[PDB]
Structure formats: C-alpha cells, structure tokens
Design a protein around this nucleic acid. Structure first.
Lengths: 44, 76, 97, 63
RNA sequence: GGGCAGUUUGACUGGGGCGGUCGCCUCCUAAAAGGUAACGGAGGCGCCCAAAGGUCCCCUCAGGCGGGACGGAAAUCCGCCGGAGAGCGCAAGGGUAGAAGGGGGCCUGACUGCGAGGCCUGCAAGCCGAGCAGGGGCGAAAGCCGGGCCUAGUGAACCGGUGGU
RNA sequence: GUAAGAGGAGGUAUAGGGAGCGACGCUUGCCCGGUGCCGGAAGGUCAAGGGGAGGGGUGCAAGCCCCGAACCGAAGCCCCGG
RNA sequence: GGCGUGCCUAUUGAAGCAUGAGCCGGCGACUCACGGUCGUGGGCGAGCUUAAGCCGUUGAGGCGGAGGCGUAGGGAAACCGAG
RNA sequence: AGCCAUGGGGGAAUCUGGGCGGACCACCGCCUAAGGCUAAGUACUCCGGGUGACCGAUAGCGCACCAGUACCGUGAGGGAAA
RNA sequence: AACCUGGGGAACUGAAACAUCUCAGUACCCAGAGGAGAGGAAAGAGAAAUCGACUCCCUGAGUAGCGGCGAGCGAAAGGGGA
C-alpha cells in the first residue's frame, strides 16, 4: 500500500509504505517534525 | 527462442591499485561480496564499496584465512 | 527523434498568467565605487545623466570601495553603503511613491 | 528573421552570469513514493549540462 | 451515424510475412583490467518485511553414525563427528559463521538540513559516501543507526489530483 | 439540392422505392445464443434544462456574486419477446 | 620493341557485362534578407550606438538618444545585493 | 477568461443613469454604448519622367522583330522562334 | 495593372506520423470603394490623483504572453517621428 504519516497537533508528513492485510491495522510511530522537535504520527 | 537476454554489466573490480594517491574519501574497490575489506583509513558502504577515510596512498595486504584487505597510509 | 533533452523540467513557475507582467518598481543596483568617480550632490537624475540607469527610475546605490563625503539622493541604499557613507557625508532616503 | 527564443526552453532553463546553463534536476515529482530522504533531497538541486548545454545558449540570447 | 471525410495502422528480422523478441537483474559465450556482438547457450524481476528494520546481549549449520515410547529414511531428545556442502524472503553470482546466519531485550537513524571526495558515464541517469548542525534511539562506555549481505522489484517531461507554508 | 424546389407521379399499395435469387419442373430443412431489424405505457442507465437542503467569496449593511445534495428531466443503451 | 583495364557516378569492390553521356557550342546548381555564434580588421571605451525621421545634397553628408547592448548577481517569487 | 463582435433564449434604467479598470465583491478612478460624416500622413504602379558596380538577343518582359501572334488544345488554356 | 475594405475561405505543408495547432484568414471566389481604401472625435488607454480622435514609420520586442507549454504563434501602453 501507499502511505504517508501525519503529525499530531499539526499537519506534517513523510514518505512511507503501508501493508494493510499483514499486522498493520494501527500505525502510531515517532518521527521528527519541523515546527519544533519530535512528536507522534498516524496513518491514512 | 527465449535466450536473448543479459544484464547491464556493472563494471566492478578494484579502481585504485596499491601505490596510488587518493583524495579525501574517493572510491577504491567496487566488489560483489567480500573479496576485499576495510583497512587503515578505509571505510565502505552498502554495496561493499571500499574507499578512503582520509587521503594518502593505497596498499594491498594479504592475510590468508583472514582474507584480503586494502588500506591507505596517509602523509601529513 | 527521441526527446531533445526536453526531459529537463519546468521550475520557472510564476512564468505567466494571462494578463501578465505586473506594475512593479524596478530598483537599479549601482556600485557607489562607480559613483564616487564624479563629485557633488548626486541624484537619480545626475546618475542616468551619465551612463548607469537607463531609466529604471528606482536606484539602489550599494556595493564596496570608497564612498565620498557627498550627498547621494537615492531610492534605496544597502545597510553596507549606508554606513560607509555615514562615514563620509550624508544620504537622503527616497522621496515617496 | 529575428530568431525566436525558444519558449519551451527558457521555461525550464536559466543561463548564468558566467555563461553555463543551469538546469533543474529530473526524477522527482512522480517516481516518488518512499524515495529515501537522501533521494528527494539530492534531487532538489539544480546542476550543469555539458555539450547540449551549448545547444541551449543557442536557443535564446535576446534573453 | 464507412453515407462521406482526414489519418493511423511500430521496430528489430541472414528478403518480407507468420512466429519470436523489445525494459531490468544473473552466469556464460567475453579471448585472466574494464568494454565487447549474433533470432548465441541457460534462468530470474514488475515484488516482499514493523519484522525480514535498529541497536545491545546471547547462541552456530547442513550431513553422518550410535541410542532413544509414539514417530520413523526424515518430527523431538542426547552422545559422538562435523569450517561450511546450511542458512541468509524469491533467479543466479559473488559473499558470509572471526555473521551478514539463529533466538531475546529495549526501540523505530524505513531522520530532518547539507554533502567533502569518487564510482560510472555521450546526455540524461544510476551509484558509493566520510563528515558538520539540530533532535533523538539501543549501549556502561567505546560506539553504532540517513532501512533490509549486495547486485532486478521499474518511467524524462508534459497535463492533472489532495495538503500546508 | 444550403434552400426554394425537382424527380417520385400529374403515379396511389393489382402502386412506387430498396434487396437478393434469377425461364420453367420438384423443392428450399433445424438453430434467434451473438448481430440486425421489428415489437415492449415498467424498470435500470441517461443530456440540456428544472429544483435550491447546504455552503463559498464580499460588503458596515441591504445586496451582490459563485459552488452546489434530494427530487423532475428524451431519444439511446441495458433488460423482455418476435 | 618495352609498358598500358576509357570518364563520371556508385561502391566492401569497377575496364567492367552497374549508372549516366553520339558530338560540339550556349544555358546550368551553395545566393540574398533579418537575427545568431565564432573569427577577423578597425573606431571609441565605463562606456559603445542610434532607429524613424528633420534639414541638406542631386551620387554630400549632418543633425536626430526613442531605443539598444554594457556596468551585479543570486532567487519561482516577495527580497536582498558582492552578495 | 475580462473586453469588442453576435447566432439562440430571457430582458432595464435617463445621470440617486450605464459601461470599463482581466472571474467576483467593496472602495477608488476611466468613460458616455446601442446614430452618423471627416482632410492629412499610408499602399499601389497601367501611365509619364529621372537614374543604375541591372540585361545586352539561350540575357533582359513570353514578345528588341507585325507576339499573346505562329502554332497545340473542343475548350479553359498553352505558347515559339526570329 | 496593382493596391483597399467587407462576404466567403482551402489543402499541400510544418509538427520529421498525425487529429488540436500549423501553413493562414494566406490561396482563391464574391461583392463594393477610390485615387486611394480603411480608420476616426473615446462607454479610450491603464496605474502616472496621468496620457487624450485616427492613420502610418521607428521603437518598445521575439518582450507580455499564447501553444498536443510540441511544432510554433506573438501583442499593448509608453518613447521617437509623419
């Protein structure tokens, strides 16, 4: 699948890849947004 | 007659022979697996590309069971 | 018959709507070292009256070298020229619009 | 008479004060997906051409 | 809606057509640098993984023989022998246990901002990367981390879709 | 033939157009799934238009200006049958 | 007596049994405008230069700075500026 | 995608009016549609004159000459030599 | 003769195919005009609380921009002059 994670409390993004079927229902991994430094992200 | 294929030759091998001045961080050896290894001031990356971590001269040592390494001795 | 090299891609966006080019001032860069030649109270007028301008209306005396202890009326200075020049004589900003 | 600046040219190339044709890097706008950060960065650059570079300067000049 | 109109209707090719093929990886042909052709000899790719990634720690095969309730040539167990004939997602090759292989813990550097110097190269493109800054991760520290042992897993540009500044 | 019109025909289905076979004798079989043609007040799909829940731009406002869901919309095709 | 395979063209290859020409004479094919990019001969130089025209000339040139190229670049732009 | 022009449909106002300033709204500015005429500068070269680092009879117009003739073609038309 | 305005309006061709595009509103057909023709007293231009009918030359300028953003196409104000 084609995926791009978004930032909480904001709207940052990054390149990524989903897999759907296989163990990939939830997706909340950490990153390094621009506005400030370091927060959590999502799926869709 | 399915048989007219081949692979774009990747042009591998060594690129800097022992006794040769190499600039800061240029390439030495592009190899398949581990025909060679790092050595005094000789890092490498994903494809197994040996290069220099400084300037200096390239040299080839042979350590039987231990394999073959290629390092650089600098001058400063 | 392949593709020239028209593979290089447009970036020069803001290339043009349909009306086109907008009515905007056009400040003219000109080194004060090229000014300090002749002397007196230099203005845009006295500047084009020479050979550096060609009616860009807006002038922007700037650059390096040795300014002169003169008055240089202009449409825009540089924080560089400004100070060297303060260390020389005087300098009036633009008129207005 | 009075050659026309190739429009499709200037819309994607700029010629520098020196005279070397700077061009925009290709390979970023579509192939993308998860191209290593190291990828889409080293692509954000501009750069130089070479022998076609001299074909280019031929297409403008009034500019 | 061939009544009528403008056109398209690929190339390679021991003529052409039929057939087959067209890009990418592997080996050979390739004549011990690289390069190297033929409708030459043989195969693979259009993917896959949040564990198959990171890092610290720990452990090392296949095979054989001997014994061992089921089992039975081969499950699992132990003894003994076993430098790699295993494994390493998938073709091949090089490579590898002095780990890149196998298990566990914590984690997500499948980072942002640049890039010294080179590899390759007609162009375009592809490729490798020391190191700096910020902010982190595993580790006592040294350190290591810009995805996977690596080499296929792909598409200039134009024209458009959604988000923000 | 752009049209006016003209042929058709100053003919009227025992007629005119198109089609195929081709004196005359004996005959001309089964298949309607595909296609064509014919038929079918439903239904599905379907354009312009109609409709204006909702919302956009703007103005101090009145207002102005735009986007637009439900619903209503023919042939056509889909569907049934010859 | 010795020696000796026409011409052009086209070609891997021609005396060629490949092309073209019976012969002679005349005609016959890389030009010009505008804009480039080299080179070159000059003039002027942080400047260089006019276009149309106006006046004059009847083969006489001159005035005409509009404009143009040049002096600052970078950047998609806003902007900044030997950055 | 404004403006000018207009095939089709709807359809004002008389200056507290209408247009335009690049979809649109507000401000601010420009302007008077839906009537009409106007010299000059401009193009041209059958015609006359001047001149040529234009031709000199296979050139120069096709035609230096009784040539758009002879001659060819039904015809349009073509078209010499000298 | 040519030039001019309006009514109509090609394809080759270029895009190294070819539809949009180009060739081009050219060729040609038609009607009308005169020594010219057209154009013309701003519902203008467009950013200067500014220029001020029209026509043409120079310029602006291969610029703004248009374009299967390909081939290619190509203005206006302003300035200089008639």
């Amino acid at each position: 699948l084609l995926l791009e994670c978004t930032e909480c409390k904001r709207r940052n993004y990054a390149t990524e890849k989903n897999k759907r079927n296989t163990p990939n229902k939830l997706e909340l991994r950490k990153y390094c947004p621009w506005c400030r430094k370091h927060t959590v992200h999502r799926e869709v | 007659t399915k048989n007219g294929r081949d692979s774009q030759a990747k042009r591998l091998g060594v690129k800097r022979y022992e006794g040769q001045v190499v600039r800061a961080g240029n390439i030495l050896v592009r190899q398949r697996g581990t025909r060679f290894k790092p050595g005094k001031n000789v890092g490498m990356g994903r494809d197994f590309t040996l290069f220099a971590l400084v300037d200096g001269v390239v040299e080839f040592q042979d350590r039987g069971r231990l394999g073959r390494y290629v390092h650089v001795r600098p001058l400063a | 018959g392949r593709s020239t090299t028209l593979m290089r891609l447009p970036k020069r966006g803001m290339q043009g709507q349909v009306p086109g080019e907008i009515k905007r001032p056009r400040y003219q860069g000109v080194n004060l070292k090229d000014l300090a030649r002749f002397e007196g109270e230099v203005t845009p007028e006295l500047l084009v009256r020479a050979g550096l301008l060609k009616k860009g209306y807006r002038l922007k005396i700037l650059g390096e070298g040795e300014a002169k202890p003169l008055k240089v009326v202009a449409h825009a200075f540089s924080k560089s020229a400004l100070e060297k020049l303060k260390a020389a004589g005087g300098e009036p900003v633009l008129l207005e619009a | 008479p009075k050659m026309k600046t190739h429009k499709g040219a200037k819309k994607r190339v700029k010629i520098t004060a020196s005279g070397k044709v700077v061009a925009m890097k290709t390979g970023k706008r579509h192939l993308n997906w998860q191209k290593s950060g190291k990828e889409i960065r080293q692509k954000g650059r501009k750069f130089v051409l070479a022998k076609p570079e001299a074909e280019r300067i031929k297409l403008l000049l009034p500019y």
